[PDB]
C-alpha cells in the first residue's frame, strides 16, 4: 500500500505529456463540410460546440457555480494550447507573436471570451477551481495584449447590461488573501514542538498566491496596450445601473498587502537571520505586490486622467510610504 | 378443508411421509380464474418438506393426500390459505385459492 | 349572493373575471420551446420573478377563496338559479380558468409548491367532483413534482382517494402519472408510498389491464353439415368417434388444449358462428359449440365437472364417442365405451351442426367417421347413424 | 396486445401502467418486485422482449420493467462500487500481467483474470405458496443465460437489419428498436454476466475491425440516433473502466 | 487506417460524430467530450484510481467482503427517504461495520471507501429534515455520532479527515446536548473527538470556531432551557446542562496532552471575558453571590427535592443542583487549563502574566479555599446491615473539587509554606481522614 501511494505521487503525477495543441487543432478542424450538405449556414465545429455547451451552462441561472470536471479539464487544455511553450532575433519574436495570435484566434473566433466573462459573472465572487481555471484561460487568450479579444469582451459587457461581472470581480478581490502572522506563528510552533509537517509547502500563510496573481494578471491584460475605453469602463461603468470601482478596490488590496508585509517584517525585525520559510513567504508576497503594482501601472499608463485622479485621491500614498519604510529597513 | 380432484392418476402406492421433500410443479389461480403463481412459468420445480409449516396449510394437506406422479386440483379455503389478511399485493383478503399440482418426485 | 342579497343589487363582474383570468394565464404562460437559449432563460427568469411577487403578495389564497366560493354551489344549474343565467353559463369556465391559474402560479417554483403544502390537504378533498377533477389533478401533479415536502403530508387517506378517483372516473393516465410521482421524487424513493400504492391497487385486478400468455387454438372439422327442419330429409341421429394417438400434457408453460364435440352455425351460412376466427378460444367457449375435455362439459365458456369411470383429462390412447340427436336436442358422450354422466340438451336447432375438435399444440388425434373414412371400435348406439 | 397499434388510448394507458409498475419497485423495493412478479410474469417478459410486432412504447416499457424488477438492484450496487479497487494478495493476483504475451498488443477489454473484490450476486425465488418471508430480501430470480443468449442473438439480428435501412424497424422507429436493447445489454454488461466468448462476439458486433481476434459496419458506424449514441458512449465508458481496472490489478501484481 | 486500439477508435469516433452532426443533447455532448478527454488523458485514470486502491491479505477476504456488503447497504439506503425501517436498517448496518475487525485493522481502507462522509451525509439529511420541528429520528443522529467518534478514535489521520467538518458540526452542536444518556453521541462530541489529543488539529483550529462556541455558551448562560421547563423542571435563569457540554469542548480545545495550548487559551479567555455572562450568574459580577455561595446554594438545591427534580434516572431526574455544580466545576477547570505554564511566567512573558492576573481577578483565592473546605457525606451502614449509598449523581462529588484543586495549583499556586499548611488543615486533612474512615472492606 505504501509503495502504491509513493509510486503514484513520485511517478504517475510527475509524468508529463504534451497533447493539447494536437487535440485543439483536431477539434477545431471542420470535418468533411462538403460531404455534410447543410444547405445553409456554416456548420459548428466540435470545439465551437464545446464552447457553446459551456457558455449555455454558465448562462443558466443558478444560485451557485457548481463545480464541473469537464470545465476544469477542457479550460486547462485550451489555456495550455494558447501558450504551447539566447535572445531571439526580430524574425523569431515576430514569428512567435504571429503564432500566439493564431492560437488565440483558434479560440476566441469560436466565442471563448464571452464564456470567460460569463463564468466569472456566474461565480458571484466565490473563489474556487472554476474561477481559477477561467482566469487562466482568460490570461491565455488575452496574453500579449490582444486588442481583438479586448474589443470582444468590452462589446459583450456593454451589450449584456451586466453588473454581476464587476460585482464578482470585487467579491473575489476582497476574498483574496494576505500574509497571516498568526498562522505563521502556529506553523512555526508546530515545528518547534517537533511535529511532523502535514504539508511541505505550508501554504496556510498566503493561502492562494497563484489565484491572486492570475486575477490581477487578468485585470492587467484587460487594459494592456492602453485600452483607454476599457480603463474608463473599469473605473466607472457608464451604461450599467450600478457601478463598482475596481480601480479603488485594487489600491485597497495593495494597502492590505502592504500592511501584511510590514507586520511580517516587524516580526522578523529583531531576529538576526531570516528563516527559509520566511524567505519563501517574502518571495510570494513580493510577487503578489509586484503584480498588483503592475496592474495599477497598466491602469495609469496612457494619460488616463480619470484613473490618475481616482488613485491620487485614494489611499495609494499610504501604501507607497509604507513600502518605502519596508524597503529602507529591509535592504 | 382442501378438496382433491384427480386430473391425472398417479402410481397410487407411494405417498409423502415424515421429512421427505416433495418436488412439484404447481399453477395457482384465484377462484375468478386469474393466475398469480406458476412454478412451470419459472421452470423451476418447487421443493418443500412436509410438517415444517414452510408452505401454506392447504398446499401441505393436498400434497400429503397426493400420490407420486399424480396430477390433481387443490381448492383451498381462505382460512387454510392466507386467512383474512391476505398476501399484500398478490392475494386479496378472503380469497379461495385453486392449485393445479403434479407430484413429480420424492427425495 | 350567499347572504341572499337581491340579484339586481348584487354586483357580479362575470365578464371581467373571465377576461382578466385569460390575461393572467397569458401573463404566467411558460416560455415556448423554439427560442434561443438565452431568450428562453430571460423568459424563465421573468416568470420566476412574477410567481415570487404574486405569492409574496399572497395571490394564491385569493384564488383559493374564489375557488371555494364557486364550489359552494353544486352545479352550473344551481349557480344559474342562485345567480343569473350568465353567471350560471360561465361558472364552469371560470372554475376551470381559476384552477389553471393556480397551476400556472405554482408550476416550477420550489417555494410556491412548498407553501402550498399546508393547503394541499384541502385541495384533494374535492377531487371526486367532476367539475374540478382535471384542474385538481394538474395542481397536485405540479406540487408533487416540485415539492418534496408535500409528499410527507400525503398519506394513505389521500392515496386511497386518488385510487378511488381512477376506479370511479375510469382509466385515466394522469392519475397514473400522479401515482408515479408519489413514489419517487428527485431520485428519492418513498417506501411507504410505494407499499401503499402497490397493496391498494395491484391485488384488485379490476382497473389496470391484465396480461397473460395464451396458447393459440385451432379447430378441425369435416365437410358434413347436419341440420334439422320440418318436412326435410335429414336423419336426426348421428354418431362419430375421435381417438387420441398422442398428446403432451405440457408442451409449454400452460396446459395443452384438447376439446371434442359438436358445433353449430348461425343460420344456413356454412361459416361457424359465435367464435372468434383466431385466439385461444375452442369448442365450448361460446353458445354455438359443445365440447368435452375428459373431465368437464364445455359450453358458453363455462365448464361443469362430469363424473365418469376413472376420471382423467384426455390423454394417449383415449377414444371419445359423441352422439347428437336433433329430434330431442341432446348431445351425449362416451369415453372408452363408458358413458359420461352428463349431456347437453335443449339447445338451439335453427342452424347446421358439424363435428369439431379444438387443440393448441402437441396433439395427435384421428377422426373415426365410420365406413370408408373410418370405423368404430365401439358400436354406435342403436338408432344413431 | 398487438391490436394496440391501432387503439391509441389503451396503448397510452398500458404504457403508463408499465411506468407505474417500474416506479413502485424503483430503487430496490424487493418486496414490491416479488409482488409484481405475479402480475407481469417471466414468460410474458421473455415474449415481449423478442416479439418483432411489439409496439414501440410497450416494448420500451417492458424492457424497463424487466430491468427494474430483476436487474436494477445488482446493477446499481456493482456500478457505484466501481471506482473502488480492493484487490486481494492471492497467487492468481500475482499471475496478472499488463500484456498477454511478449507482443505489446492490448488484449480485448473484459477478458482476463480480474481478482478485484466486487459485490456478491444473490437472488431469491419468487414463490407465493411459501410462508417464509425472509425471501423478500434480494431481487427475484431470472435466467441470466437465457437472457444473455437472447440479447446477443437479437443484437446480432438488429445490427445486420439496421444497416440495410429498412422501413419497418421493430417498434416502428430506430430509437424504439435500439435504445431498449442496448440498455438491456449495458445492464447485463455492468452486472458482468457476459464472459469470454460472449464478450468477443458482442465486441465484434460493436466494431469488427478494432476487436479482431488473431462491408460489415458496426453500430458505431451505422449512423445511430442521438439516444443510441448516448448508450454507445456509456458502453465505451464501461470498456475504458474495465481497462483501467486491469491496469490497476497489473500494477498491484508488480508491487 | 485501422485504429487497432480502443483509445484510438473512441478518439476517432467522438470527433467524427461531433463534426458530423450538431448535437442537440447537452448530455450527449458532455458524454462525448468527457470520453474524449478520458482517452487523451490516459494517465489521469491511474492518478484518480491509485488513491482508491487498497490491498488486503487473503485471510481478510471474507470479512472485507462482509464490510463491503454492509457499506453497500448503508450507501444504497441514502437514495431512499428517511423512515422507521430505514433507521432500523442503518442501525443494524452500522453495528455490523463496527463489529467487523477490518474497521480497526485497516483505517486507510475505511477512509478510502469514503464511509465517514457517507455517515456525515446521513446525519445531514436527518438533521436538515424539519429543522424547525426540533429533531426527527433522534436515534439516527446518536448512532451516526457514535460511529464518527469511534472513527476518530481509530486513527489520527481519521481525526484530520473529520476535522474538515468542524464548522457544520459546531453549527449543529445544539442537537442533543440537553438530553442526557446521549453523552458522547452528539455532534459536539464528534467535534471534541476530532480535536481530541491532537496538537496539530488544536493549533489549526481557527478563532471563529471558538467564537461560535462562546456565543452558544453566552446564550446558554443568559437564557433558560426550554425542554426542561416544558417537562416541568424549575425555571432558573441559566442553563447548566447545556453550558457544561460547551465548556468541555473548550477545555479539549485549549488543553491537549498535558500542556496548555497558549494560542487557543488566550483567545478563549478573551472571548469569555468580553462576554462575561458565560461565567454563570454567580461569577457574572453585577451582584452575584460568588463561587462559594453558589456552591452551597447548589448544595441546598440538591437536598431540596422540589428545586432539584421537575416535580410535576439522571436523565429523567436531572438533578439541578448537580448540574449547577458540574457547570461551575467545568468552568473552573477550563480557566485553570487556560492558565499559562510556569516556564512562561519564569521567562516573564507579559501576555502570560496578564492572563494569570486576569484569572486571579476572576477567581478569588478565598472562594477556592472555601469550596475545597466543603466536605462530603459518606455512606453509612444501615441498621439492617446494608450500607446506604447516597447517589452522587444528585450530590457533591470529588470530581467537583478536582477542578478546584487544578485551578488552585495552576493559577494561584502554592508558594507560601503558611498558605500550604492553612489550605491543608482547612480542606485536605479532613478529606484524608474521611478516606481513612472509609477503609473497612464493606465500606470501601
Running DSSP on this structure, what letter comes out for residue A29? S
Give how far D197 is from chain A: nearest CA, Å.
Answer: 33
- Give how far Cα A260 sits from Cα of A174, A266, A273, A319, Å: 15, 10, 20, 11
CA distance E294 to chain D (A): 59
Rg for chain A, CA atoms, rounded: 23
The Cα–Cα gap between C183 and C173 comes to 16
d(CA C92, CA D187): 50
Q: What are phi and psi of E196, to 5 degrees?
A: -80, 125
Task: Check contact A-B (3+ Cβ pairs < 8 Å).
Answer: no
Alpha-carbon distance values, E52 to A244, C281, D254 (Å) = 46, 62, 17
Instruction: Look at residues D69, D78, D19, D30 and name the one whose alpha carbon lies nearest to residue D46.
Output: D69
Query: Residue A26 is nearest to which of E15, E34, E263, comparing CB atoms?
Result: E15
Which cell numbers hold the place of D77? Answer: 450496487
Rounded Cα distance between B97 and C216, Å, is 26
Q: Which of E5, E8, E9, E86 to mutate to test the interface with D (most CBs of D within 10 A)?
A: E9
Question: Residue A58's closest chain C neighbor by CA?
Answer: C38
* Separation CA D39–CA C212 (nearest Å): 9
The H or E element that residue B101 is part of is strand B97-106
Give the three cell numbers for residue E162.
Answer: 473529520
Subunits with at least 3 CB pairs below 8 A relative to chain E? Answer: A, C, D
E window 59-98, beta carbon within 8 A of C = 79-81, 83, 85-86
- Give chain E positions within 8 Å (CB) of D28: 76, 80
Which residue is associated with the grid cell 487568450? A141
Most E CBs within 10 A among D81, D84, D231, hence the mutation to make, goes to: D84
Interface touch B59/D41, C-beta < 8 Å: no
Burial of E364 (0-12, 13-18, 19+ CB in 10 A): middle
Which chain D residues contact residue B37 at CB under 8 A?
38, 127-129
Q: Are strands E259-260 and C237-247 parallel, antiparallel or unpaired?
A: unpaired
Question: Does the beta-carbon distance from D88 to E57 stay under 8 Å?
Answer: yes
Backbone angles phi, psi at E259, to 5 degrees: -115, 145
Query: How many other C-beta atoms are found inside a 10 Å radius of the C-beta of residue E405?
Result: 19
DSSP at A76: H
Q: Is D133 touching B (CB cutoff 8 A)?
A: no
Query: 3-state SS of chain C?
Result: CCCCCCCCCCCCCHHHHHHHHHHHHHHCCCCCCCCCHHHHHHHHHHHHHHHHHHHHCCHHHHHHHHHHHHHCCCCHHHHHHHCCHHHHHHHHHHHHHHHHHHHHHHCCCCCHHHHCHHHHHHHHCCCCCCCCHHHHHHHHHHHHHHCCCHHHHCCHHHHHHHHHHHHHHCCCHHHHHHHHHHHEECCEECHHHHHHHHHHHHHHCCCCCCCCCCCCCEEECCCCCECCCCCCCCCCEEEEEEEEEEECCCCCCCCCCEEEEEEECCCCCCCCCCCCCCCCCCCCCCCCEEEECCCEEEECCEEEECCCCCCCCCCCCEEEEEEEECCCCEEEEEECCEEEEEEEECCCCCCCEEEEEEECCCEEEEEECCCCCCCCCCCCCCCCC
Q: Do B40 and C295 touch (CB under 8 A)?
A: no
Return d(Cα C45, Cα C56) in angstroms, integer.
16
Q: In three state form, how does the secondary structure of B14-70 look?
A: CCCCCCCEEEEEEEEEECCCCEEEEHHHHCCCEEEECCCCCECHHHHHHHHHCCCCC
* DSSP three-state, residue A40: coil
Residues followed by a gap in chain A, C→N > 2.5 Å: 85
Contact C210 B34 (CB under 8 A): yes
Minimal Cβ distance to D23: which of C184, C210, C253: C184
Residue of E nearest to A37 (CA): E20
A-chain CB neighbours of C38 within 8 Å are: 59
Instruction: Count the Cβ atoms, other than its own, within 10 Å of residue D172.
Output: 16
Q: Do C192 and E79 touch (CB under 8 A)?
A: no
Binary contact (E23, D77; C-beta < 8 A): no
Please provide residue C379's backbone torsions phi and psi, each rounded to the nearest 5 degrees.
-65, 140
Determine contact, residues D255/A4, Cβ cutoff 8 Å.
Answer: yes
Q: Within 13 Å and on the Cβ side, how many CA atoms surround C324? A: 28
Q: Give residues 207 to 226 of C whose Cβ lies within 8 Å of B.
A: 210, 212
- Please provide the size of chain A in residues: 331
Please report, for residues A188, A264, D161, D177, D178, the alpha-carbon distance to residue D154 in angstroms, rounded to integers and kept in the order given.
69, 74, 10, 10, 10
- Which of E19, E108, E163, E344 to mutate to test binding with chain A, by most A CBs within 10 Å of its CB? E19
Report chain C residues whose CB lies below 8 A from the CB of D9.
Answer: 171
Place of cell 479567555: E269
**CA–CA dist C166, C144 (Å, integer):** 18
D41 touches chain C (CB under 8 A): yes
Asked if C370 and C240 touch (Cβ cutoff 8 Å), the reply is: yes
Alpha-carbon torsion, ordered E40, E42, E47, E53, to 10 deg: 140
Task: Identify any residues that bridge with B8 across adjacent strands, giving them in sequence order.
Answer: B71
CA C28 vs CA C43, C134, C137: distances in Å: 10, 19, 19
Q: Decide if B34 touches C, using CB distance below 8 A.
A: yes
Is residue A307 within 8 Å of A300, Cβ to Cβ?
Answer: yes
Give this entry's resolution in angstroms.
Answer: 3.6
Beta strands in E336-443 (DSSP E): 380-381, 387-388
From A45, A315, D175, select the one nearest A323 (Cα to Cα).
A315
Contacts A49 to E, Cβ<8 Å:
18, 22-23, 29
Residue numbers of B annotated as active site: 26, 36-37, 56, 82, 99
Angstrom distances, CA of residue A78 to CA of A26, A51, A297, B15, C278? 12, 10, 29, 81, 67
Return the closest-CA partner of residue D41 out of B31, B40, C256, B91.
B40
- What count of Cα atoms within 13 Å lies in the side-chain half-sphere of residue A66? 9
Structure letter (DSSP) for residue D106 = P
Distance CA(C306)–CA(C331), nearest Å, equals 14
State residue B9 phi and psi, 5-degree precision: -75, 155
Distance (Å) of CA A89 to CA A86, A101, A144, D89? 9, 18, 18, 60
Residues 6+ apart with CB under 8 A from B73: B4, B5, B7, B98, B99, B100, B101
Say whether B9 and C312 touch across the interface (CB within 8 A): yes
Kindly determine whether residue C194 and residue D32, on different chains, have CB atoms separated by under 8 Å.
yes
Contact D41 C184 (CB under 8 A): no
Chains C–E, number of C-beta pairs less than 8 Å apart: 15
CB contact under 8 A, D42 and B41: yes
Pairing status of strand E387-388 against strand C188-189: unpaired
This entry's atomic model was obtained through cryo-EM
> Which chain E residues are closer than 8 Å to C189 by Cβ?
79-81
Closest residue to D248, CB basis, from E17, E24, E53? E53
CA distance D90 to chain E (A): 6
Name the residue among E78, E45, C184 with its Cα closest to residue D82. E45
Amino acid at each position: 500500500n505504501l509503495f502504491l501511494q509513493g509510486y503514484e505521487k513520485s511517478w504517475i503525477e510527475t509524468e508529463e505529456h504534451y497533447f493539447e495543441d494536437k487535440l485543439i487543432e483536431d477539434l477545431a478542424k471542420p470535418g468533411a463540410e462538403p460531404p455534410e450538405e447543410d444547405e445553409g449556414t456554416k456548420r459548428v465545429d466540435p470545439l465551437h460546440q464545446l464552447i457553446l455547451l459551456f457558455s449555455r451552462t454558465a448562462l443558466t441561472e443558478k444560485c451557485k457555480l457548481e463545480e464541473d470536471f469537464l470545465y476544469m479539464a477542457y479550460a486547462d487544455i485550451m489555456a495550455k494550447s494558447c501558450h504551447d511553450e539566447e535572445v531571439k532575433s526580430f524574425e523569431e519574436k515576430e514569428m512567435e507573436k504571429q503564432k500566439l495570435l493564431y492560437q488565440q484566434a483558434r479560440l476566441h473566433d469560436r466565442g471563448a471570451a464571452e464564456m470567460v466573462l460569463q463564468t466569472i459573472s456566474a461565480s458571484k465572487g466565490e473563489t474556487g477551481p472554476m474561477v481559477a481555471a477561467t482566469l487562466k484561460l482568460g490570461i491565455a487568450i488575452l496574453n500579449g495584449g490582444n486588442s481583438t479579444v479586448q474589443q470582444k469582451m468590452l462589446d459583450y459587457l456593454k451589450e449584456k447590461k451586466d453588473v454581476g461581472f464587476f460585482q464578482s470581480l470585487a467579491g473575489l478581490m476582497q476574498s483574496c488573501s494576505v500574509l497571516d502572522l498568526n498562522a505563521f506563528e502556529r506553523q512555526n510552533k508546530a515545528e518547534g514542538l517537533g511535529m511532523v509537517t502535514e504539508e511541505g509547502s505550508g501554504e496556510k500563510v498566503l493561502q492562494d498566491d497563484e489565484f491572486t496573481c492570475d486575477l490581477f494578471r487578468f485585470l492587467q491584460l484587460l487594459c494592456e496596450g492602453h485600452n483607454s475605453d476599457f480603463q474608463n469602463y473599469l473605473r466607472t461603468q457608464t451604461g450599467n445601473n450600478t457601478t463598482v470601482n475596481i480601480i479603488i478596490s485594487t489600491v485597497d488590496y495593495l494597502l492590505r498587502v502592504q500592511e501584511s508585509i510590514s507586520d511580517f517584517y516587524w516580526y522578523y525585525s529583531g531576529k538576526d537571520v531570516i528563516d527559509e520559510q520566511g524567505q519563501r513567504n517574502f518571495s510570494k508576497a513580493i510577487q503578489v505586490a509586484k503584480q498588483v503594482f503592475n496592474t495599477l501601472t497598466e491602469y495609469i499608463q496612457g494619460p488616463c486622467t480619470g484613473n490618475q485622479q481616482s488613485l491620487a485621491h485614494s489611499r495609494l500614498w499610504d501604501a507607497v510610504v509604507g513600502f518605502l519604510h519596508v524597503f529602507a529597513h529591509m535592504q | 378443508g382442501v378438496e382433491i380432484e384427480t386430473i391425472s392418476p398417479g402410481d397410487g402406492r407411494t405417498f409423502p411421509k415424515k421429512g421427505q421433500t416433495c418436488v412439484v410443479h404447481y399453477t395457482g389461480m384465484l377462484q375468478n380464474g386469474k393466475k398469480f403463481d406458476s412454478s412451470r412459468d419459472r421452470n423451476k420445480p418447487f421443493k418443500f418438506r412436509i410438517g415444517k409449516q414452510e408452505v401454506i396449510k392447504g398446499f401441505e394437506e393436498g400434497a400429503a393426500q397426493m400420490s407420486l406422479g399424480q396430477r390433481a386440483k387443490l381448492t383451498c379455503t381462505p382460512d387454510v390459505a392466507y386467512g383474512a389478511t391476505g398476501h399484500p399485493g398478490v392475494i386479496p383478503p378472503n380469497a379461495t385459492l385453486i392449485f393445479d399440482v403434479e407430484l413429480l418426485n420424492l427425495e | 349572493l350567499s347572504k341572499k342579497a337581491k340579484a339586481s343589487t348584487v354586483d357580479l363582474p362575470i365578464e371581467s373575471v373571465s377576461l382578466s383570468l385569460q390575461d393572467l394565464i397569458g401573463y404566467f404562460h411558460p416560455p415556448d420551446e423554439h427560442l434561443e437559449h438565452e431568450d428562453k432563460q430571460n423568459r424563465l427568469r421573468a416568470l420566476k420573478n412574477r410567481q415570487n411577487l404574486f405569492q409574496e403578495e399572497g395571490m394564491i389564497n385569493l384564488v383559493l377563496e374564489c375557488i371555494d366560493r364557486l364550489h359552494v354551489y353544486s352545479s352550473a344549474a344551481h349557480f344559474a338559479d342562485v345567480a343569473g343565467r350568465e353567471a350560471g353559463e360561465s361558472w364552469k369556465s371560470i372554475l376551470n380558468s381559476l384552477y389553471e391559474l393556480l397551476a400556472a402560479l405554482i408550476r416550477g417554483n420550489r417555494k410556491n409548491c412548498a407553501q402550498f403544502s399546508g393547503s394541499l390537504d384541502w385541495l384533494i378533498s374535492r377531487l371526486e367532483r367532476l367539475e374540478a377533477s382535471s384542474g385538481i389533478l394538474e395542481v397536485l401533479h405540479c406540487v408533487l413534482v416540485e415539492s418534496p415536502e408535500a409528499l410527507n403530508i400525503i398519506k394513505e387517506g389521500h392515496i386511497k382517494s386518488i385510487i378511488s378517483l381512477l376506479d370511479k372516473h375510469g382509466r385515466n393516465h394522469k392519475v397514473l402519472d400522479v401515482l408515479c410521482s408519489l413514489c419517487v421524487c428527485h431520485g428519492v424513493a418513498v417506501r411507504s408510498n410505494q407499499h401503499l400504492i402497490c397493496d391498494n391497487l395491484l391485488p384488485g385486478r379490476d382497473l389496470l389491464l391484465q396480461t397473460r400468455l395464451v396458447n393459440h387454438v385451432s379447430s378441425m372439422r369435416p365437410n358434413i353439415f347436419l341440420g334439422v327442419s320440418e318436412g326435410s330429409a335429414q336423419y336426426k341421429k348421428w354418431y362419430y368417434e375421435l381417438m387420441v394417438d398422442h398428446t403432451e400434457p405440457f408442451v409449454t408453460a400452460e396446459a395443452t388444449h384438447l376439446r371434442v364435440g359438436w358445433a353449430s352455425t348461425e343460420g344456413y351460412s356454412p361459416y361457424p358462428g359465435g367464435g372468434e376466427e383466431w385466439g385461444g378460444n375452442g369448442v365450448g367457449d361460446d353458445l354455438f359449440s359443445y365440447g368435452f375435455d375428459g373431465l368437464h362439459l364445455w359450453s358458453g365458456c363455462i365448464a361443469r365437472t362430469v363424473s365418469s369411470p376413472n376420471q382423467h383429462l384426455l390423454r394417449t390412447d383415449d377414444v371419445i364417442s359423441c352422439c347428437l340427436d336433433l329430434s330431442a336436442p341432446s348431445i351425449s358422450f362416451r369415453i372408452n365405451g363408458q358413458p359420461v354422466q352428463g349431456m347437453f340438451e335443449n339447445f338451439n336447432i335453427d342452424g347446421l351442426f358439424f363435428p369439431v375438435v379444438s387443440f393448441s399444440a402437441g396433439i395427435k388425434v384421428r377422426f373415426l367417421l365410420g365406413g370408408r373414412h373410418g370405423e368404430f371400435k365401439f358400436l354406435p348406439p342403436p338408432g344413431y347413424a | 396486445i398487438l391490436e394496440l397499434t391501432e387503439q391509441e388510448e389503451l396503448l397510452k394507458f398500458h404504457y403508463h401502467t408499465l411506468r407505474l409498475y417500474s416506479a413502485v419497485c424503483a430503487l430496490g423495493n424487493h418486496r414490491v418486485a416479488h409482488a409484481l412478479c405475479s402480475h407481469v410474469d417471466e414468460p410474458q417478459l421473455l415474449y415481449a422482449i423478442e416479439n418483432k410486432y411489439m409496439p414501440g412504447l410497450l416494448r420500451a416499457g417492458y424492457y424497463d420493467l424487466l430491468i427494474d424488477i430483476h436487474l436494477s438492484s445488482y446493477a446499481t450496487a456493482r456500478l457505484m462500487m466501481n471506482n473502488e479497487y480492493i484487490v486481494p494478495m492471492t497467487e492468481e493476483t500475482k499471475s496478472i500481467t499488463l500484456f498477454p504475451d511478449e507482443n505489446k498488443k492490448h488484449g480485448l477489454p473484459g477478458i482476463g483474470l480480474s481478482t478485484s473484490l466486487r459485490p456478491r450476486m444473490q437472488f431469491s425465488s419468487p414463490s407465493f405458496v411459501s410462508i417464509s418471508n425472509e425471501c423478500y430480501q434480494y431481487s427475484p430470480e431470472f435466467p441470466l443465460d437465457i437472457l444473455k443468449s437472447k440479447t446477443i442473438q437479437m443484437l446480432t439480428e438488429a445490427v445486420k437489419e439496421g444497416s440495410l435501412h429498412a422501413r419497418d424497424p421493430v417498434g416502428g422507429t430506430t430509437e424504439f428498436l435500439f435504445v431498449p436493447l442496448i440498455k438491456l445489454f449495458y445492464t447485463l454488461l455492468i452486472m458482468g454476466i457476459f464472459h469470454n466468448e460472449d464478450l468477443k462476439h458482442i465486441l465484434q458486433l460493436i466494431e469488427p475491425s478494432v476487436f479482431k481476434e488473431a462491408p460489415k459496419e458496426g453500430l458505431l458506424q451505422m449512423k445511430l440516433p442521438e439516444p443510441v449514441k448516448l448508450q454507445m458512449c456509456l458502453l465505451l465508458q464501461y470498456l475504458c473502466d474495465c481497462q483501467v481496472r486491469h491496469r490497476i490489478e497489473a500494477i498491484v501484481a508488480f508491487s | 487506417k485501422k485504429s487497432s486500439t480502443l483509445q484510438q477508435l473512441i478518439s476517432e469516433t467522438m470527433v467524427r460524430w461531433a463534426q458530423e452532426s450538431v448535437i442537440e443533447d447537452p448530455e450527449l455532448v458532455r458524454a462525448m467530450f468527457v470520453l474524449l478527454h478520458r482517452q487523451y488523458d490516459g494517465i489521469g485514470g491511474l492518478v484518480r484510481a491509485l488513491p482508491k486502491t487498497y490491498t488486503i491479505n487473503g485471510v481478510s477476504v471474507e470479512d472485507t467482503i462482509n464490510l463491503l456488503a454492509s457499506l453497500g447497504q448503508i450507501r444504497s439506503l441514502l437514495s431512499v427517504r428517511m423512515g422507521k425501517e430505514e433507521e432500523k436498517l442503518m442501525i443494524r448496518g452500522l453495528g455490523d461495520i463496527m463489529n467487523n475487525k477490518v474497521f480497526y485493522q485497516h483505517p486507510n481502507l475505511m477512509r478510502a471507501l469514503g464511509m465517514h462522509e457517507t455517515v456525515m451525509e446521513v446525519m445531514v439529511n436527518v438533521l436538515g429534515g424539519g429543522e424547525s420541528k426540533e429533531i426527527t429520528f433522534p436515534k439516527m443522529v446518536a448512532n451516526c455520532c457514535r460511529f464518527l467518534c469511534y472513527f476518530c478514535r481509530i486513527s489520527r489521520q481519521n481525526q484530520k479527515a473529520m476535522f474538515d467538518h468542524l464548522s457544520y458540526l459546531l453549527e449543529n452542536s445544539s442537537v442533543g446536548l440537553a438530553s442526557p444518556a446521549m453523552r458522547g453521541s452528539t455532534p459536539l462530541d464528534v467535534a471534541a473527538a476530532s480535536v481530541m489529543d491532537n496538537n496539530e488539529l488544536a493549533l489549526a483550529l481557527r478563532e471563529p470556531d471558538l467564537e461560535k462556541v462562546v456565543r452558544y455558551l453566552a446564550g446558554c448562560g443568559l437564557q433558560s432551557c426550554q425542554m426542561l421547563v416544558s417537562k416541568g423542571y424549575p425555571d432558573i435563569g441559566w442553563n447548566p446542562v447545556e453550558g457544561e457540554r460547551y465548556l468541555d469542548f473548550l477545555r479539549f480545545a485549549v488543553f491537549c496532552n498535558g500542556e496548555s495550548v497558549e494560542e487557543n487559551a488566550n483567545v478563549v479567555v478573551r472571548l469569555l471575558i468580553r462576554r462575561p455572562e458565560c461565567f454563570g450568574p454567580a461569577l457574572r459580577g453585577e451582584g452575584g453571590n460568588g463561587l462559594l455561595a453558589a456552591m452551597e446554594e447548589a448544595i441546598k438545591i440538591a437536598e431540596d427535592p422540589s428545586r432539584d427534580g421537575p416535580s410535576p434516572e439522571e436523565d429523567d431526574t436531572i438533578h439541578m443542583g448537580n448540574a449547577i455544580m458540574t457547570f461551575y466545576s467545568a468552568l473552573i477547570d477550563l480557566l485553570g487549563r487556560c492558565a499559562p505554564e510556569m516556564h512562561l511566567i519564569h521567562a516573564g512573558k507579559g501576555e502570560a502574566i496578564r492572563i494569570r492576573s486576569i484569572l486571579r481577578s476572576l477567581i478569588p483565592l478565598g472562594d477556592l479555599v472555601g469550596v475545597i473546605s466543603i466536605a462530603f457525606q459518606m455512606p453509612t451502614i444501615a441498621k439492617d446491615g446494608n450500607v446506604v449509598e447516597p447517589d452522587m449523581s444528585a450530590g457533591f462529588c470529588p470530581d467537583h473539587k478536582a477542578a478546584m484543586v487544578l485551578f488552585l495549583d495552576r493559577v494561584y499556586g502554592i508558594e507560601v509554606q503558611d498558605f500550604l499548611l492553612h489550605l491543608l488543615e482547612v480542606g485536605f486533612l479532613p478529606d484524608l481522614r474521611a478516606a481513612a474512615s472509609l477503609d473497612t472492606a464493606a465500606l470501601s
